[PDB]
């Protein structure tokens, strides 16, 4: 056997490929011919029959006749005059738009996009100013894709790759039967892949190790390796001819093999006893949101390479710092100082001294390990009851196994951090701002704020210890809920508002003011007690007019109830749509939130020059955080606020608000608005032409019926013209497509095992619907999940194990109470108590 | 007998006067035959210029100096709209013909052609409409493709009067102005294409026979790919479950297919559709077969490229296939350099079999093969040359000028390399990236850019329309004496 002889055999085996294609094509062509559609919906009589030749406006038609093979015109240019029937239209078109405008409840995260086509503005004359204006514009759009320092692939090779990939798809099935026919010693796909990793370089030496870990390095005898080395060279001589367009190296075929391709994925998510726990909870600690509790959400950073860095425990040191502090809090509370369905401890010890017990597997001992660690130095909560409900095993088995392995925690050092003095501008104890606070800090100034991970250091929150809250910015910023520092040890820790009133409190204009209002932020349902946001901020209590008539007036965005509004034709000259009031809006009332896609300053300019015109302009970009460079694009996704027009003396006004570590845009009434009136706001000094790196962007300063109006009003979906007096349409937000988007994202993760994905997709499907933003409502919504999916959870081994990992992470975080764990214990054993009752 | 093999020849050609006289030029953008008339009825078609609708009746004549065409109706859309899209429909109550016309304003105008009145107007699209298509499954369903990058599905049914828009194909599936919309015969699948270079296949739900407060929005297609063509797609169509499409600067009409797609399987739900997770992937499909040795199984397959030369930078040129049970399938298309092309798809299969037999005979008889046309028996021809001479039957329409060519021209066996090559160039299908030469390529007098093609229900008439308000009528199975 030799390279020249192998390449000869391949050439004859290759002539199978074009004779096989011909067979296929002809086969499908005969098949479609046979299945030709029989014409339907035929009228019983000829409907045109009555009509005769028409030979008041009149138009010319000159006829000509042809004969023979070349179709030579038998010159008879005979023209007849025909009467025209002028049909003027009764209906006017709607104002213009681009894309289907869909409604999103809250802002959704978006991926940075590239231009993969040629935007055609209009017909340009060859060698003219119009051509030079258009061609220079496309070269400037190529410069935006290149500015990112990204994978700048020229169209010359895009077309070439496309072509090569198509050929690789063609030959791939042929490889195994061809190899099988040749029957060469050492010429097996696995061995050819073995040779691929070994002989260079288009693979990472790290990826090379992985491929050689899956397969071996073993491919001996030394003549068998000669054969594999010969075949690769022989194949490239036949199918990888460098002078050809339909070209493909053997390397490229092996690269798409099912056992090869999952090594080159680029879609990755992620005390010896403790180490095991850390690895076991990995997925939950890495993807699980600290804000909304989802493993796929609209929170987290999208890096230039479109990879997500979630707002998870890994952002604040992972499991260990958050948990070490829990144990410390637990051993300190210890100084001051329940029965279930399937047995317990007060009734049964380790069960019977000599009772036959089935052997526990590695997965079962694992569930005992991580649950004991996350509960730790507890007083009330005991793992055995819950692990019992999870593993299905009787409660006394978890006592027996716990004694068998003798579980001992790591100890926690006395973390009695010395006393620090209070800040000259902020009293965390009396909950108020004093002195030159507005100059001292930048917490309230969102336009100049730069996002950073909450501080997770063990020392004090100063510049010397390296606290970012205090040192990273131009000025210090108040420590928020996700900082590991506590209120008794750190003077920067935000503690909420001391606000309370029999009437309305936490108002824009007040004896002593509301710190939340002053800090340009809504009230925290947890920290802002007795104000009393815990009840009002809850969207389930959103239409309770007697609840909102008093108390916390600062939870407008959190209640998510917007004043009734209508879409219509704007009063302004050539403006298209405008938003109109459907009800009466009094001064100082929350109208609507500006929702859209969360994009970078960079992505915003990319979209602007992609969609925009040089021969011109419409923009739905709103700045959320000027410094960090986060913008809100309402071009496709958002709400009716996307249609509000510009006017210097508007009736409403936008304000960036900190809403539980979520920056949000709110519109408040700066005038008294009557129904049928057009809503307006001053767009800011960043939008150009407005008459009654550079991107046109709007900024901020740093039951019912169709109303009576002169202008036409349209339904946002159907675009049908609504007539006054009719019931005002209120279409509920359909999230299904967005839930689908999130389920699939998780499914596309390589380093997520099928068992993990199943629970993660089920938890997220459920939780993304509740739009949780405060930990204050997680217990409620957790109990609803453990109740609704109770039967689903008991039915599988993996589901219980996965569910416990989620429960462990939330416990370690001190975000899930003890009482909620035992209530979940009771609903799971009752769900399993009904599985045996009928199974 | 051999009449099934004939292809059209130029008959009548009319130059309608300039209707768009604003200094851009007046052109005929859409030709469509009425599909609901009973069998045998003289074919009636509509021709759409920038501001007019010409309605003609064609009747076969015995005299070669007579004009079969008769303009029975001529309408003028009195507006500022420059029309280009058109489709036929029926009055849901009276069953009288309806003609849909859309242009650069964004409204679909339904005309009661027989009475010369306006039936209704379909409002909602936020840009100009470029293509209109009627559901083969339901004559009241209309699909419109607009510059607003969306597709609106409309129902002319009495239950859908207040709100005629039954469906919206939106989401992020398309990013720029749409140029083509096509229907599957089942009326459940829709093809869409345009400037963004993406070809999308959508599955429509079942629409209730009641009032719809809001249309059903479809966020994702069931198949989406921008990798079939490297340029803007202006014409897309279904041919069975197979796809035909064309792009600018490519000189081809591509016959390809979605791997795993069969209209014989159940229509997938909206939540079965592939969502775009990995952006570094320009093709996604619900249909993809699960069985494969490759981690990435091919989602589509390029089958054949119909060579349609001299188009260049010209776009908004549409092909039309004649596909009726019992007759041959004929693909017709006119280029930007005054030529009308024809392909009889029944020819490939016959050639394939002819060549396969010829190859087999050449091997079995060592090149001593005699080929005799159909019009003499095989066992009759075999007796003339006896045993030791192979005899292959050649389809009559195969004309001269892996299979070995004759050595010298006086040789009793085989065809010239030039004859075989000429044949291969028109009927060979072994190369997905090959160029199939037109089976009939008819020239046109003066500068002509083809826009739309239309076949008469019995495939006896082929009307091609284009620049300078022109229409070229081609005839087959003539009555001329």
């Amino acid at each position: 056997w030799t390279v020249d002889k192998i390449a000869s055999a391949l050439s004859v085996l290759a002539e199978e490929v074009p004779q096989n294609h011909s067979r296929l094509v002809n086969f499908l062509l005969e098949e479609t011919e046979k299945r030709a559609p029989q014409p339907r919906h035929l009228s019983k009589t000829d409907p045109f029959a009555h009509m005769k030749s028409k030979a008041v406006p009149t138009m010319d038609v000159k006829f000509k006749q042809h004969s023979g093979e070349y179709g030579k015109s038998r010159n008879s240019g005979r023209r007849f005059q025909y009467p025209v029937v002028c049909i003027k239209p009764d209906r006017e078109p709607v104002p213009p738009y681009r894309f289907h405008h869909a409604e999103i409840r809250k802002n959704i995260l978006a991926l940075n996009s590239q231009l993969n086509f040629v935007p055609h503005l209009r017909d340009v004359d060859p060698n003219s100013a119009e051509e030079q204006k258009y061609s220079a514009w496309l070269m400037d759009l190529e410069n935006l894709d290149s500015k990112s320092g990204f994978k700048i692939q020229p169209r010359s090779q895009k077309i070439a790759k496309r072509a090569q990939a198509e050929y690789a798809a063609t030959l791939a099935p042929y490889l195994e039967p061809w190899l099988r026919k040749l029957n060469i010693e050492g010429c097996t796909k696995s061995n050819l892949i073995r040779f691929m990793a070994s002989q260079p370089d288009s693979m990472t030496p790290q990826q090379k190790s992985n491929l050689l870990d899956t397969y071996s390095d073993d491919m001996g005898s030394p003549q068998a390796v000669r054969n594999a080395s010969m075949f690769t060279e022989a194949w490239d001589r036949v199918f990888n001819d460098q002078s050809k367009l339909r070209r493909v190296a053997l390397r490229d075929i092996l690269m798409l093999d099912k056992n090869v391709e999952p090594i080159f994925d680029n879609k990755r998510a992620k005390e010896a006893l403790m180490q095991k726990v850390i690895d076991a909870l990995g997925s939950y600690t890495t993807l699980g949101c600290l804000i909304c509790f989802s493993h796929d959400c609209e929170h987290g950073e999208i890096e230039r390479d479109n990879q997500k860095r979630c707002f998870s425990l890994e952002e604040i040191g992972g499991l260990m710092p958050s948990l070490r502090r829990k144990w410390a809090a637990q051993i300190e509370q210890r100084q001051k100082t329940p029965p279930c369905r399937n047995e317990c401890y007060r009734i049964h010890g380790t069960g019977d001294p000599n009772q036959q017990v089935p052997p526990w597997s590695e997965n079962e001992v694992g569930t005992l390990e991580w649950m004991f660690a996350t509960i730790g130095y507890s007083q009330t909560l005991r793992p055995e009851c819950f692990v019992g409900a999870i593993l299905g095993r009787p409660c006394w088995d978890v006592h027996r196994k716990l004694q068998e392995l003798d579980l001992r925690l790591p100890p926690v050092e006395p973390r009695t951090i010395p006393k620090q003095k209070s800040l000259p501008w902020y009293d965390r104890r009396k909950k108020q701002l004093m002195s030159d606070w507005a100059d001292a800090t930048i917490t309230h100034e969102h336009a100049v704020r730069e996002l950073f991970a909450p501080c997770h250091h063990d020392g004090p929150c100063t510049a010397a210890n390296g606290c970012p809250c205090a040192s990273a910015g131009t000025h210090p910023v108040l420590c928020e809920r996700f900082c590991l520092c506590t209120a008794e040890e750190c003077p920067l820790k935000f503690t909420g508002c001391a606000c309370h009133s029999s009437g309305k409190t936490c108002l824009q204009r007040q004896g002593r003011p509301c710190i939340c209002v002053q800090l340009n932020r809504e009230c925290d349902p947890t920290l802002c007690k007795g104000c009393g946001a815990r009840e009002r901020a809850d969207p389930e209590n959103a239409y309770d007019e007697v609840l909102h008539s008093t108390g916390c007036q600062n939870v407008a965005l959190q209640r998510g109830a917007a004043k009734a509004v209508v879409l219509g034709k704007s009063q302004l000259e050539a403006c298209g749509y405008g938003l109109f009031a459907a009800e009466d809006i009094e001064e100082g009332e929350f109208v609507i939130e500006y929702t859209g896609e969360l994009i970078s300053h960079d992505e915003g300019v990319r979209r602007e020059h992609r969609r925009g015109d040089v021969f011109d302009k419409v923009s739905y970009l709103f700045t959320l955080l000027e410094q960090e460079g986060i913008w809100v694009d309402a071009a496709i996704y958002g709400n009716l606020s996307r249609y509000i027009n510009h006017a210097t003396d508007g009736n409403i006004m936008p304000k960036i608000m900190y809403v539980n570590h979520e920056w949000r845009i709110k519109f408040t009434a700066i005038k008294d608005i009557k129904a049928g009136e057009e809503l307006f706001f001053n767009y800011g000094d960043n939008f150009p032409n407005l008459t009654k790196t550079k991107a046109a962007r709007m900024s901020a300063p740093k039951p019912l019926l169709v109303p009576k109006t002169t202008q036409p009003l349209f339904d946002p979906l159907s675009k049908v013209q609504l007539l006054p007096g009719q019931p005002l349409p209120q279409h509920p937000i359909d999230d299904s497509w967005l839930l689908l988007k999130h389920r699939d994202n998780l499914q596309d993760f390589i380093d997520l095992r099928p068992e993990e994905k199943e629970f993660l997709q089920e938890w997220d499907a459920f939780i993304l619907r509740r739009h949780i933003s405060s930990e204050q409502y997680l217990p409620r919504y957790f109990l609803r999940f453990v109740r609704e999916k109770a039967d689903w959870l008991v039915s599988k081994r993996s589901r219980g194990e996965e569910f416990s990992k989620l429960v462990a992470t939330l416990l370690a975080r001190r975000v899930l109470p003890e009482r909620v764990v035992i209530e979940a214990t009771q609903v799971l054993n009752d769900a399993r108590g009904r599985l045996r009752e009928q199974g | 007998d051999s009449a099934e093999w004939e292809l059209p020849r130029l008959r009548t050609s009319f130059i309608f006067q300039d209707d768009y006289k604003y200094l851009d030029l007046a052109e005929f953008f859409d030709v469509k035959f009425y599909p609901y008339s009973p069998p045998g009825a003289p074919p009636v078609f509509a021709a759409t210029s920038k501001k007019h609708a010409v309605i003609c009746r064609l009747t076969q004549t015995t005299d070669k100096d007579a004009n079969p065409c008769e303009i029975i109706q001529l309408i003028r859309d009195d507006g500022n709209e420059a029309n280009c899209a058109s489709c036929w429909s029926k009055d849901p109550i009276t069953d009288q013909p309806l003609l849909c016309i859309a242009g650069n304003e964004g409204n679909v105008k339904v005309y009661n052609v027989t009475e010369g009145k306006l039936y209704r107007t379909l409002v909602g699209h936020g840009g100009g409409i470029n293509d209109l298509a009627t559901s083969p499954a339901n004559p009241y369903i209309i699909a419109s493709a607009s510059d607003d990058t969306t597709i609106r599905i409309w129902s002319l049914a009495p239950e859908h009067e207040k709100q005629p828009c039954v469906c919206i194909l939106g989401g992020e599936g398309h990013s720029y102005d749409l140029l083509s919309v096509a229907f599957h015969d089942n009326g459940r699948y829709v093809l869409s294409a345009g400037h963004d270079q993406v070809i999308n296949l959508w599955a429509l739900p079942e629409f209730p026979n009641e009032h719809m407060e809001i249309p059903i929005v479809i966020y994702y297609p069931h198949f989406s790919s921008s990798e079939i063509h490297n340029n803007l797609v202006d014409c897309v169509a279904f041919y069975g479950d197979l796809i035909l499409s064309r792009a600018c600067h490519e000189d081809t009409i591509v016959l390809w297919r979605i791997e795993g797609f069969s209209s014989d399987d159940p229509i997938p739900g909206p939540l079965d559709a592939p969502t775009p997770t990995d952006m570094t992937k320009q093709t996604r499909s619900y249909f993809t077969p699960t069985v494969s040795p490759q981690s990435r199984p091919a989602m589509f397959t390029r089958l054949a490229q119909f060579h349609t030369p001299d188009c260049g930078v010209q776009f908004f040129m549409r092909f039309r296939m004649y596909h009726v049970p019992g007759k041959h399938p004929i693909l017709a298309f006119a280029n930007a350099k005054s030529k009308t092309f024809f392909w009889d798809l029944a020819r490939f299969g016959e050639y394939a079999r002819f060549m396969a037999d010829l190859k087999e005979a050449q091997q079995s008889y060592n090149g001593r093969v005699v080929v005799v046309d159909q019009g003499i028996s095989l066992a009759q021809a075999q007796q003339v040359h006896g045993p030791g001479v192979g005899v292959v039957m050649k389809p009559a329409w195969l004309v001269p000028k892996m299979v070995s060519a004759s050595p010298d021209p006086d040789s009793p066996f085989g065809f010239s390399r030039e004859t075989l090559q000429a044949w291969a160039d028109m009927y060979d299908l072994s190369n997905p990236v090959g160029l199939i030469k037109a089976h009939r390529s008819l020239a046109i007098d003066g500068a002509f850019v083809g826009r739309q093609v239309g076949w008469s229900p019995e495939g006896e008439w082929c009307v091609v329309v284009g620049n300078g308000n022109r229409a070229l009528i081609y005839q087959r199975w003539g009555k001329e004496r």
Partner: peptide, 8 residues
């Protein structure tokens, strides 16, 4: 570069 209308 692309063109939709025919040159006269």
């Amino acid at each position: 570069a692309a063109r939709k209308s025919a040159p006269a």
